[PDB]
Amino acid sequence: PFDLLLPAAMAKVAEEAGVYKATKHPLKTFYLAITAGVFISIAFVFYITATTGTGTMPFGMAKLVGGICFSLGLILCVVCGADLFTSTVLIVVAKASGRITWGQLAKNWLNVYFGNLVGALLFVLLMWLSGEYMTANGQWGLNVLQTADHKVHHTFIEAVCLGILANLMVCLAVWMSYSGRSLMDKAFIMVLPVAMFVASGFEHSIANMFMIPMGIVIRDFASPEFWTAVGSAPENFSHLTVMNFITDNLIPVTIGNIIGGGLLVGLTYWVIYLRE
Amino acid sequence: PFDLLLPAAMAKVAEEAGVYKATKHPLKTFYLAITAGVFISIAFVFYITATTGTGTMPFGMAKLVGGICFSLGLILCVVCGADLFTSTVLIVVAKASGRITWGQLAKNWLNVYFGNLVGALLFVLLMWLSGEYMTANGQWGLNVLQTADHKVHHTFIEAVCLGILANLMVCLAVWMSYSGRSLMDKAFIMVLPVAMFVASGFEHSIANMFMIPMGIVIRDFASPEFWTAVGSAPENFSHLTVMNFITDNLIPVTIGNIIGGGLLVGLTYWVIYLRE
Amino acid sequence: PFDLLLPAAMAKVAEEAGVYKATKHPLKTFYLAITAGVFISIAFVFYITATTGTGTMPFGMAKLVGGICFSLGLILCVVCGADLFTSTVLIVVAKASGRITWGQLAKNWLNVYFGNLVGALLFVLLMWLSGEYMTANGQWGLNVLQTADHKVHHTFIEAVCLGILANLMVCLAVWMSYSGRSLMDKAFIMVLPVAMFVASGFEHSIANMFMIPMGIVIRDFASPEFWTAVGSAPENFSHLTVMNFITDNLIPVTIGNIIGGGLLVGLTYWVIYLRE
Amino acid sequence: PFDLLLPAAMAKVAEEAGVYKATKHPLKTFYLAITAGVFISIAFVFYITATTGTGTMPFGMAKLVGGICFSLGLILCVVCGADLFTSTVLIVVAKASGRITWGQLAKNWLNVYFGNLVGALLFVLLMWLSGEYMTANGQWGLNVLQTADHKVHHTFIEAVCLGILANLMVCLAVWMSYSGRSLMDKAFIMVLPVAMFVASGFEHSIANMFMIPMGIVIRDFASPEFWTAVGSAPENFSHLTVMNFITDNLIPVTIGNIIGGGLLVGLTYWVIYLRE
Amino acid sequence: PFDLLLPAAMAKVAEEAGVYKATKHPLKTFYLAITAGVFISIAFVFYITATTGTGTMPFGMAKLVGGICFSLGLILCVVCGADLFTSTVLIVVAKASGRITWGQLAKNWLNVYFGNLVGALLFVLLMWLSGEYMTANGQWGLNVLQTADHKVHHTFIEAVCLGILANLMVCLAVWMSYSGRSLMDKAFIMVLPVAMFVASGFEHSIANMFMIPMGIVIRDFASPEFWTAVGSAPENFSHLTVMNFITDNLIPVTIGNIIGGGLLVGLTYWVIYLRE
């Protein structure tokens, strides 16, 4: 009663979590999804801050420290009970157990995905009004522009597979937190699995619903003083469009995200510990 | 009974905390507010110490390590029960529940804000008498001068939004500590959320009530040996005035601080878990 | 009842773990072995990510930080209950106690080894489809090529002894986690012992069932744009063949792995605490 | 009963600690004071070791890592129950409660201060006999000489105020450990507050009773091979005398140390939580 | 019952530990001593790995990180119950209490010292067969050669005093682990005290029974390709002999080790908390 949960018990807590989430009031789900969109946006802002000025640093060392900074948003989601689309894909365990319906799964996923977008877009506005892009002599905004520009240059299969790898890591972090009982147990078990996906360039749909939109805003409304300082032009980031974001990144990464956490984490552990 | 609190229970502990704080004796509130002004001043002195000599270092890596150093002051506030204006804005949860009155909220906020200023100003005196500005051949005082000078060059909207972002981070750190039961749980859950706001250049009213006043004192009473060593003049910091501090930074950052923690952390979680 | 287990009690939990593992359903053992093959593959991908760009860094400092990144896969195996061939060699404690049969030990080892290979090979496919080898301008794939190429140049005795050293470290990490009761205890006790084997270049059979196969795939299907960027040719990695992998690395490292954990960790602790 | 102590309860544990310490047998107090003098000496030796060779490093980053190394001595004092003059100043809480007499407070302070000096001086002897000053080609002894030389060049007010700041940090670390219940809680809560005072150049009387005496011994008995390697002469450290130590540093820093922890930590918390 | 042990209770657990250790079966003591010789050998191999390539790094920063790597071996000894000669010197507390006889103390010390040598020498063989000396282009073996060569150039008094300082640190780490109740408490309380002795160049008899023997083996059986790569000759390490090891290092460091932990940690704490 003070010891970590075992893999069979962690599977039952995952099942009850999905029964709770899918049966919560819709507006509560939307409000918790807006907080999770804001939490993932804060974590990406922390990642961009920590990775500003790190071109002289070893590539993997810079990516790792920024990945530990991105871990805050997932810890916030778990401790504060926010609804993140990636983690909410694990309600498939409750679906496989027949404890929830397909319409309950579909309505919860649309509520969380849409709310996560509203929260991520609201944080872009506040981040734009803060003048943060001009930090480090515009190097903060150039980091966002360069991060957002690469996330739109992947092929469909590359984006789907990068999404599978990201939600596998996120859902394994959320699954391992089920074993935890304290706040330190749950939080620290999630640092390394998130650092990994962020350092390894895996794609998360909600994280990208903040990064690419923010880079599109910088390219469009950045000052000429920004372009002078960073020594570039908006035409170097011409492919940073809303349509390129949905087609090139959002659609394939989201498809991959569902497959990663749903099939690999959720349905595997249901087969091993719950199908019985 | 050994496990972390859940989001609904954390909301009730936030409500009872505000009922406690707003109903404490006024002089106890003033004395705890002076300690919190001193605690935030110590954390900024630690930030300045850690970030002295870091112009050769990657911008975000230097900001992150100084942000972990600033986390000490918030941990001190939480463990030692000090009254910080930013965290005391969460007494709006008790106000929304009708458990406290508007005059109780207004009197507690003025008591904490004024006491936080007295504590921050008392630490400036002790820091000035210590000769700390001449540390690192005056590089410690130049770090304070350069930090204080930028905090006065923001537009009203930029300062308000930077204040919203800071108190959102501070109040989310304080909210997540409510889940904690041990000293390690509460303290470590607050490191990354504070590092973020400090590394990301967000503005905290009480932190600025120490930084800018300290930079004004250095500009005015620094020795000619200081200006020789740092290779600058007081005229490079002409906009570091008390009037510029209140108008350019204090008023807008404080307005933003109330909106960040009160509306975003407090009233959101009251709607989701307490409005019932 | 809240204190760490003592060496005698940790030996009994090791015995009961082997009785559980060897008596689990075969398909459950195969499925948990596929997850462990994927978990060790994720840890090596994290190691490669963190160690990309670190030729300018001190050799041991770069190896140590990548070793902490590889620790995630073992933590995942322990918390999520996955079957790793290295840790499953400790079922020899149950065999020595006469609590399991030799055919039970042989069938479990073949089930785990084969499943660990399937999981490691499935992750190579996903990693190849992600385009990750072209990360850091191909420096990610060159790190894999250079890591895989050295792991095939050892003599039989060197490979056997490097395998003994690796499984001694892995099984001592798994043994020390038996003392732990919380998730933080079990996880953190395993970081330094795994970092050591990874930093010290010891050889793990399942880790190599991902690294060398992945390097063979890069050498064979890498783009000419990859070879241009990394400034090399596939002929620099001619000895990266499937046959060289089995003979030069897989067979001797696996023999060594059994001796390291089975004889040194398992049969020693059985003699001291269970032979009674 | 598993949760951290609250500020009111931490004040009562501080009161009972002072009643215990002031009423312990005098020889037990002297022996525990000699251990605390040795513990603070070990922490300064660790600080000097970690900060040797760090002139190429950013000033604050080098000071911070050495400050975490100095934290060991305070952790040792708290866990092993040693009597450190700085922490024993908090017996003023028991004095203010009328639970101890003024003669009990005076006799305990003289016993601890004298014993702390004996322990610090005994460690200087062992450190001198070890030949440690010649480590890093004499750079270890030059670090001690340069650290000790600056600690004697402060004005009386600067030294008193640097002593107030040091014992405020030390006594706040000791106060926050009262909230802790486990060994990890108590130890980790004391790392950042001690790192701060060490990184920020604050002055501790017992730490200086090891540093300056050790630098005086190096200046006087260092080999000519030492002066050749470090490229200096004893005449560069002419002000490192026993009389300069007492007048320039010991007397004012000790006065400041009493004011810092006694008045600021002890009498403040007694007014807020115990004067009732 | 969940709180750390107090200094008086930690003294009684130290007394009962020595009564257990000295009364264990001799062959169990020999087998646990062989594991401790292997555990300290692994920690030194980790130290050498982490400190390879660190001549460009600040001396103290490199020594500190390698010292955290050496901490693994002591954690392993404590968690896995191994018999290390340094920690077994604390059975003097049971001897002083009259709970064990002088012949029991002498027989246990010889059993542990001899077994620690067998384990350290067995790990040298495995490390030699692994080809690890050629790691980092022979820089791993040169680090061992340079570490082993300096450990033989100390005077008798320097070696005795460096041994006193090492076992004081090791026995204080073991004493502080007695306060711990969890695996994280016991393990983390031992990291900084061990890092200190390793970073500060203190001498441990069992650690040296692996380092110097390993350097003698490299000097004697290293390939001419090793000497070419490292750009040296065996004649640069002529004083690395077995006879120089015993006389110059083993005998004086062991004498010092007994005095450090026995008299300073054991007999002091027995006088303060057990002589009653």
Numbering used by the authors:
A (entry chain A), B (entry chain A), C (entry chain A), D (entry chain A), E (entry chain A): 6 to 281
Describing publication, verbatim:
FocA belongs to the widespread, evolutionarily ancient formate-nitrite transporter (FNT) family of pentameric anion channels and translocates formic acid bidirectionally. Central to the FNT family’s function are conserved histidine and threonine residues (H209 and T91 in E. coli FocA), both of which are essential for pH-dependent formate:H+ symport into fermenting E. coli cells. Here, we show the high-resolution structure of native E. coli FocA, together with the H209N variant, and describe the dynamic pore features that couple to the protonation state.
Here, we identify compartmentalized polarity distribution across the complete FocA pore structure – resolved at 2.56 Å – mirrored against a two-fold axis with H209 at its center. Thereafter, 3665 micrographs were collected, displaying clear side and top views of the pentameric protein complex, leading to high-quality 2D class averages. The final FocA structure was reconstructed from 302,937 single-particles, achieving a resolution of 2.56 Å (FSC = 0.143), and showing a thorough sampling across orientations (Sampling Compensation Factor (SCF) = 0.87, Supplementary Fig. 3H), with the local resolutions being ~2.3-2.7 Å. In addition, compared to HSC’s pore-forming N-terminus and PfFNT’s β-barrel, FocA’s N-terminus forms a loop parallel to the pentameric cytoplasmic face, creating the flattest surface among known FocA structures, and generally among FNTs. This flatness of the surface is imposed by the entirely flat positioning of the N-terminal α-helix on the cytosolic face of the FocA pentamer, as compared to other FNTs. Resolving the complete FocA structure allows us to trace the formate channel in the native assembly. The channel is constrained by mainly hydrophobic residues, especially phenylalanine, whereas the periplasmic side displays a partially positive charge, conveyed by lysine (K68 and K165) and histidine (H155) residues. The formate channel around this key residue is highly constrained: while the H209 is coordinated by an interaction with T91 (dvdw = 3.6 Å), which supports in vivo data indicating that this represents the open channel, the channel’s path itself is sterically confined by two opposing phenylalanine residues (F75 and F202), forming a spatial gate. In addition, side chain flexibility can modulate the effective pore diameter, as illustrated by comparing the “radius”, defined by the side chain atoms, with the “free radius”, based on the main chain atoms. The difference between these radii suggests that side chain flexibility can act both as a steric barrier that shifts dynamically and as a mechanism of substrate selectivity, since the substrate must remain in contact with the side chains to pass. In particular, the Phe-gate of F75 and F202 plays a crucial role in this dynamic channel range.
